Amino acid sequence: GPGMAVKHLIVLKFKDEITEAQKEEFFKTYVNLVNIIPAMKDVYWGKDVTQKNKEEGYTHIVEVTFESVETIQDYIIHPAHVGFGDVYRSFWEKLLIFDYTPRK
């Protein structure tokens, strides 16, 4: 219902040649998208500490929280978009993006 969250889950493996400073700047820019994208309300990210997925190799997670029933197209065309944008789409060796409403 109203006020339900729409979440994106970004699942990343960075290319070997991406530097630690580059990764940090990427996450910093993503967190700040909240201030730029009206429908975007939260960004939290994390580094996996367990490494139990064998050969899949994903290491980082970004959780993006959006308001529901609001356009997010300004995010889709934003230069910083991890999949579509010119700025960061070269950073990842592997990338998955999911779009779901959390429920219980």
Added chain:
Amino acid sequence: AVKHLIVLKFKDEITEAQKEEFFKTYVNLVNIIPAMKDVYWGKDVTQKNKEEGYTHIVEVTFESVETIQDYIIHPAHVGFGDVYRSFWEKLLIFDYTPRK
């Protein structure tokens, strides 16, 4: 807090009723396993992912990486995996501290 995150793809044979059963049963583990804090799950709506990719996300909150492991080895979790592992084709597990 820390997050135990599950990304899963069900086996092709699994029905909608069985996915509902899977998540109802899993969410109820919070009533049984002391270590668990909140559980949320959701279905991916991305058309790109649906044919062959992962389809469902489960988020579980824990106090620490230690209490994630308390959950992992709890009899009720061992039991859950024993009889519901058959439901998934593959999964990804991540344990991390969210930050901004």
